[PDB]
Amino acid sequence: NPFHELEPGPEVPEVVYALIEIPKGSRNKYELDKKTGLLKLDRVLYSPFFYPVDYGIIPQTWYDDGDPFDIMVIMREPVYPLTIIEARPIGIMKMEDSGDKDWKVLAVPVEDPYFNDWKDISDVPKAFLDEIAHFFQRYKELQGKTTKIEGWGNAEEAKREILRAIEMYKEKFG
Amino acid sequence: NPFHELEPGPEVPEVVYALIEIPKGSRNKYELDKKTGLLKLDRVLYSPFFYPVDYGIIPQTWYDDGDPFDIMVIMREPVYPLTIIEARPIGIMKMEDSGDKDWKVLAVPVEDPYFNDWKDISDVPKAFLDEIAHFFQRYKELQGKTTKIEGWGNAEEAKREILRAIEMYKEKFG
Amino acid sequence: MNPFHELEPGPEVPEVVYALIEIPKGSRNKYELDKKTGLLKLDRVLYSPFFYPVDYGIIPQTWYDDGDPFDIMVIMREPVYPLTIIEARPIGIMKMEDSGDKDWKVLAVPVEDPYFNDWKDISDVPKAFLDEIAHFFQRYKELQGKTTKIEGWGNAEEAKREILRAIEMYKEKFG
Amino acid sequence: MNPFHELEPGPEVPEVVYALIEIPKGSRNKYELDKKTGLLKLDRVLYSPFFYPVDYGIIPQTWYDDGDPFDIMVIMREPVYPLTIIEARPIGIMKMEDSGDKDWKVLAVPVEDPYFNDWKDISDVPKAFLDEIAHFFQRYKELQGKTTKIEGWGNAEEAKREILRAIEMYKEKFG
Amino acid sequence: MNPFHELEPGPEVPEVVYALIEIPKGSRNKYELDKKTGLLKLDRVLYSPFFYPVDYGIIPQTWYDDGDPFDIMVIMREPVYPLTIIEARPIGIMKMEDSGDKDWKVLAVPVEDPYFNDWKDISDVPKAFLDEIAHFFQRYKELQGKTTKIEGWGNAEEAKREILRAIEMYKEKFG
Amino acid sequence: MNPFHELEPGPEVPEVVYALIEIPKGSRNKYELDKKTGLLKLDRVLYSPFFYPVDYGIIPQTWYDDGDPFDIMVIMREPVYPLTIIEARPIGIMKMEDSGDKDWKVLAVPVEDPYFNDWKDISDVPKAFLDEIAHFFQRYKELQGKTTKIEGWGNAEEAKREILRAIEMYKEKFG
Numbered sequence A, B: 001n002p003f004h005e006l007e008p009g010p011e012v013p014e015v016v017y018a019l020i021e022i023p024k025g026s027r028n029k030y031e032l033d034k035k036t037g038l039l040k041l042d043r044v045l046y047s048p049f050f051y052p053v054d055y056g057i058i059p060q061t062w063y064d065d066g067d068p069f070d071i072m073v074i075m076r077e078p079v080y081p082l083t084i085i086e087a088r089p090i091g092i093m094k095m096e097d098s099g100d101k102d103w104k105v106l107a108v109p110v111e112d113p114y115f116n117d118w119k120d121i122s123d124v125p126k127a128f129l130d131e132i133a134h135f136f137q138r139y140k141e142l143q144g145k146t147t148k149i150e151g152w153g154n155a156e157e158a159k160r161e162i163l164r165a166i167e168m169y170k171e172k173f174g
Numbered sequence C, D, E, F: 001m002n003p004f005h006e007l008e009p010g011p012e013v014p015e016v017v018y019a020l021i022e023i024p025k026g027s028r029n030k031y032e033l034d035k036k037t038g039l040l041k042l043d044r045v046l047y048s049p050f051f052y053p054v055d056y057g058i059i060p061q062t063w064y065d066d067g068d069p070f071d072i073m074v075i076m077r078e079p080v081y082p083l084t085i086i087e088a089r090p091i092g093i094m095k096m097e098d099s100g101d102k103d104w105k106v107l108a109v110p111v112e113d114p115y116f117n118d119w120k121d122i123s124d125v126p127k128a129f130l131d132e133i134a135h136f137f138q139r140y141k142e143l144q145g146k147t148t149k150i151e152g153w154g155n156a157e158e159a160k161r162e163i164l165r166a167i168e169m170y171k172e173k174f175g
């Protein structure tokens, strides 16, 4: 299982690995099968929305909601599921999903020179942050779930949470 | 301008023409330029939603909101903008957009045998009607606009509104 | 690790099975699982300009009369990637023979797409869609000189019966 | 207006003709020119999961024995959009009958794609590719109960002669 | 009707112009407007495996020093279809010469995508993106034996200046 | 595990080899095998708007002068997914140097696509296509300031000899 075998990053927390589960533009929500590590269909979103970013997890992390720590990587061309990307955290989306702390790192790929000058949350166009928050605010509405979006934190805050999640993993597993 | 030159349908109101502006899966919202009849970008949706149906207008119609009557055609493979489809109305979505009556016909293509037994609103899976209503409920949320979804009418009601819109066009233009 | 051998046939057999997808809807490339390694392998490029009309794969830990894992076709609105696991509800079975071999294939819908919540048996599928699937398997190997015979469609109960047979066959051959 | 009537048959007929594309390679939707309106119109969704193996259209200002514009079928590496004009070199012709009507089709390559610079006649096309095109037309209307008959392929010389005949037929019937 | 002649250069020249798109981002096919009819036409297939990095088109009712309509590149997140009109804000201009011809091209953002609300001048564009556009035009005709010289980028004010020049040139040649 | 170490070089080397695909035709993303992890990893986004003109990968259990697995580049009509195995016939070899290192690449066609049945050597490939591949490799790292040198193409005989040498080098370095 790639979640357990891969390190959290080559230079934590400045550069982490993102293990992508869902490419931008997908309406299918994929997850990793915990037994086998194969990709598994979790569900088809109930609404005609698509993931606005490549979406995945940071290996060897664990979070308050009892899952690996989520990461969103802005890719110009989406990658395939189960692709590793070297990513620089630039911010963090604060949200609760049904009372669980479900925060998500926002990151850019180190190896696309397009994003060389994106280093903090203030470098992202605000319409783009709004569209991401709106997606998570409404994507489970027809399943009757409520999500609360609490805002965006900056790069420093993102990196602190990554360190916290790396420590939580070490506790729970070994 | 195709809006003025084409008849409303070969067998109104059982079979109408749909002039498609937006193929299913588009985030770009297109309209017809009224001067030239060329396709024009109206806007990019502010949220990562895609049109869940091929979306267009019925030629030579006019509606209470001061626009051609809208029609949504369920296509398995989306068509290109400015394509004419022969469509059978099977229902109607009732909604208001900023206080304007903005109802939209739901239809299936006559020439796809997949839909041969779809003749009324009750033949559509309810999750699919929900996803369409949810799209129109939220797609302008970040533009600060409010839309109210009032429910779905059946095929007979759709066909009555089509006749009304065909008459309204004749009044206003000639 | 070979997914075919390592995954259970499903979480609630035969009402819900796992489909391990090999070929997404819309592909002209026909992929298979490499027997030795479990990697995806190109079997062939179809000789005609036809595309797979459904997401196509196998049920893990099954064996059928034709000497292969039992095939399953899953109706997906948006195709998945190869090697994706889908929890699927069987709703019917296509009966066909390919060069003397019984090459029947389960038809299924995904449990986690609410669009298909009411599809529970073969009669819930538009007839034109069943015909398009059957026509595909009737003709897709015509230029390879192969003849296939479509024998018709069986219902959900029959599909479930055959899944149980295939699971038992696997146990006898490998277990 | 109607591009079918407004555009010349080609800049150097019959060596180079215009192909007015109606259906891009890969489409399961079959489009046709209103022929009175001029705008693209959905004729049908193919009943089988087959896709057009070439970019398909008509030569402007032509008329053929079947009572329609002359079908041309251009090999493109990347498909174009409907209503795009391509300068095309005829390299052959598919002889077929559809419902008894002579429904022959020109096969051509784009002048402005150097990939095909050395394709000049029907013998330059891989045989498997000619077979895939013929098989598509043999079977694409099978579920509609129509019968087509594939009679074989003619060479570039024959295709060019037929183009000139179609140009003459248009003049007699309209001009 | 020919869109190039019938549409105004824009609703609020030179702050907002119309871009009539001929080539969507991601295309290897290079399309143009047919001079006589206004239909889309394949100009060529690029000789190298490069794709247009931006949606590419022309400003209606303009004429430039190189004897063609003035070209405009629009940065779109999702590409449009050919012959689509986009209201665009010019933010810069690429200066380049193609075989002795001044072939400068306006860079613009769509007015109706809020993603670009803060892009108002050449300095707002990531440098790597400008380089990728320039590299494309530097090399895309290399195998055709053509040499192009990239002279650099001008700012929004310069782009607007040139748009006004191009509008005047059109009036003098056709009006 | 790591498919690079687990899979044989081919079922009938050097006439038929396995190509383990890392990058599908059309990708601007350059992927590489963790080579220790085994999972697909993004190496870089190409700095220019170029796309891989072929499906690109490596031959398992090979090692080459450049200190990596032997690059193979399979002509597919429909691209495959990363980590797919294709049975491939070598028809030639591209000789090139990258940063001074001998970075030669096998060119191959799939055994199971009848379209390429008559492609057996480098002379069977359209010259424009060989030029497009070479131009891609000549220029794709230009904005990274790297220099590559294209030295030309060898025939099938030469490609096969090099495959055997690479198989031997792997054995010496690992086996």
Ligand SMILES: [Ca+2]
Pocket: A063, A065, A067, A068, A069, A070, A101, A102, A103
């Ligand atoms: Ca979480």
Ligand SMILES: [Ca+2]
Pocket: B063, B065, B067, B068, B069, B070, B101, B102, B103
């Ligand atoms: Ca309306």
Ligand SMILES: [Ca+2]
Pocket: C064, C066, C068, C069, C070, C071, C103, C104
């Ligand atoms: Ca089977």
Ligand SMILES: [Ca+2]
Pocket: D064, D066, D068, D069, D070, D071, D102, D103, D104
């Ligand atoms: Ca015909």
Ligand SMILES: [Ca+2]
Pocket: E064, E066, E068, E069, E070, E071, E103, E104
């Ligand atoms: Ca120019």
Ligand SMILES: [Ca+2]
Pocket: F064, F066, F068, F069, F070, F071, F102, F103, F104
């Ligand atoms: Ca190498």
